[PDB]
Design a protein around this ligand. Structure first.
Ligand code: CL
Ligand code: CL
Ligand code: CL
Ligand code: CL
Ligand code: CL
Ligand code: CL
Ligand code: CL
Ligand code: CL
Ligand code: CL
Ligand code: CL
Ligand code: CL
Ligand code: CL
Ligand code: CL
Ligand code: CL
Ligand code: CL
Length: 305
C-alpha cells in the first residue's frame, strides 16, 4: 500500500487493554487506546469475548492525515470486517483527499465515497457488518481542512488549539434501527446518510481529533433529536464538553473521565450483589493535525517506501 500507517488496532483480546505508545514518524501525534468497559456480574456480584473494534491512523502519500474508527456488529465476523477495512477502505483515502481538494462540494464528494464503500462491501465483503466514521485532511486555498462522515454509533470530536471541543461526527441513534455498513442499511443509503453525520471544517496544526467507539452513555449529551418519515426518532449524541477543560489533550482527558466513571460503575455494580450486565468495547484514537514541515517529511518518507 502507499499510505503510511502510524497506528492500527485490530480488536483486542478479552481481558486485555492495548496502549499503542507514540510513533516517532509523526512526532507523537497519533495514538490508540483500547479497553473493554463490559461488566458482567453473577448473583454473588463476582466477575464472569474479543473486541470487534478497529482504528487505523496514518497519512496518505501526500502527507494528509486520516483516522478511521470501526465497530463490528458480530464476533464471528470480526476478521471479515478487519480485512474489509484494510483491502477496500484504506485504499480509497488518498483519492478522497485529492477529490476534496479538486471538487467544489465536499458534501457530494463524501456522499459519493459512502456509496462506493457500500458497493464494495456488497461486492466483496458480505460478512463485513460494521459502523464507521472517518476523516481525512486536504489542502485547498493554501489552508488545511478536514472532512469525513460517520454512519452509526462511533464518534469523532476535535479540541481546537484554543481549547474548545466540538463534535465533528456524532453518535447517531435511530429508533428501531442500527444504521451501519451492512446489507440491511444498503437498501436506502441516501436516507441513512441524511440522518447520520457528514462534515467539513477548517483545521490548524495542533488541533486534536479524537475518534471513539463506545463511551458510557451518561458522558454524552443530545445535541439534536428529530423525526424522520420512513415514523422514527433520530438522536445525535455528542461528547458532553462539560466534563473537560482546556489544558490537557482531549485524548488524555477522555481516557481519565471514562476510567473514573467506569470505576464508579463497577463499584456500584459489585455492591448491589446482583446480576449486572452492561458496557461495551472502548477504543479511542488520537490524531493531532500536522504542520507543513511534518507533512513534507511524510511525503518524502512515503516515496522511499
Ligand atoms: Cl492487558
Ligand atoms: Cl456477537
Ligand atoms: Cl475484504
Ligand atoms: Cl493503502
Ligand atoms: Cl477518485
Ligand atoms: Cl464544501
Ligand atoms: Cl460536507
Ligand atoms: Cl450497495
Ligand atoms: Cl465477507
Ligand atoms: Cl492549497
Ligand atoms: Cl455533529
Ligand atoms: Cl440505532
Ligand atoms: Cl435512500
Ligand atoms: Cl463546557
Ligand atoms: Cl504549518
Amino acid at each position: 500500500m502507499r499510505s503510511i500507517i502510524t497506528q492500527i488496532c485490530n480488536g483486542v483480546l478479552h481481558g486485555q487493554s492495548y496502549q499503542s505508545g507514540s510513533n516517532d514518524l509523526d512526532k507523537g501525534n497519533s495514538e490508540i487506546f483500547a479497553s473493554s468497559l463490559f461488566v458482567h456480574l453473577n448473583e454473588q456480584g463476582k466477575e464472569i469475548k474479543d473486541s470487534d473494534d478497529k482504528i487505523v491512523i496514518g497519512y496518505t502519500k501526500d502527507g494528509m492525515a486520516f483516522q478511521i474508527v470501526v465497530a463490528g456488529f458480530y464476533g464471528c465476523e470480526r476478521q471479515a470486517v478487519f480485512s474489509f477495512i484494510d483491502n477496500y477502505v484504506l485504499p480509497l483515502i488518498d483519492n478522497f483527499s485529492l477529490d476534496l481538494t479538486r471538487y467544489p462540494d465536499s458534501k457530494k464528494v463524501t456522499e459519493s465515497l459512502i456509496h462506493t464503500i457500500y458497493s464494495l462491501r456488497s461486492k466483496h465483503a458480505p460478512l463485513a457488518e460494521f459502523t464507521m466514521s472517518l476523516c481525512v485532511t486536504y489542502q485547498k486555498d493554501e489552508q488545511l481542512f478536514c472532512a469525513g462522515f460517520g454512519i452509526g454509533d462511533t464518534g469523532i470530536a476535535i479540541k481546537r488549539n484554543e481549547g474548545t471541543i466540538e463534535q465533528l461526527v456524532c453518535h447517531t441513534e435511530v429508533d428501531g434501527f442500527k444504521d451501519a455498513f451492512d446489507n440491511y442499511s444498503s437498501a436506502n443509503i441516501d436516507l441513512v446518510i441524511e440522518r447520520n453525520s457528514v462534515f467539513n471544517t477548517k483545521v490548524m496544526p495542533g488541533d486534536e481529533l479524537v475518534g471513539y467507539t463506545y463511551v458510557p452513555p451518561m458522558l454524552e449529551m443530545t445535541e439534536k433529536e428529530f423525526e424522520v418519515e420512513t415514523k422514527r426518532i433520530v438522536r445525535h449524541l455528542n461528547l458532553d464538553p462539560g466534563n473537560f477543560d482546556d489544558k490537557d489533550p482531549l485524548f488524555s482527558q477522555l481516557l481519565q473521565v471514562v476510567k473514573s466513571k467506569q470505576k464508579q460503575l463497577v463499584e456500584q455494580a459489585k455492591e448491589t450483589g446482583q446480576i449486572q450486565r452492561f458496557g461495551d468495547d472502548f477504543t479511542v484514537g488520537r490524531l493531532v493535525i500536522p504542520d507543513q514541515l511534518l507533512i513534507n517529511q511524510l511525503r518524502i518518507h512515503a516515496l522511499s517506501h
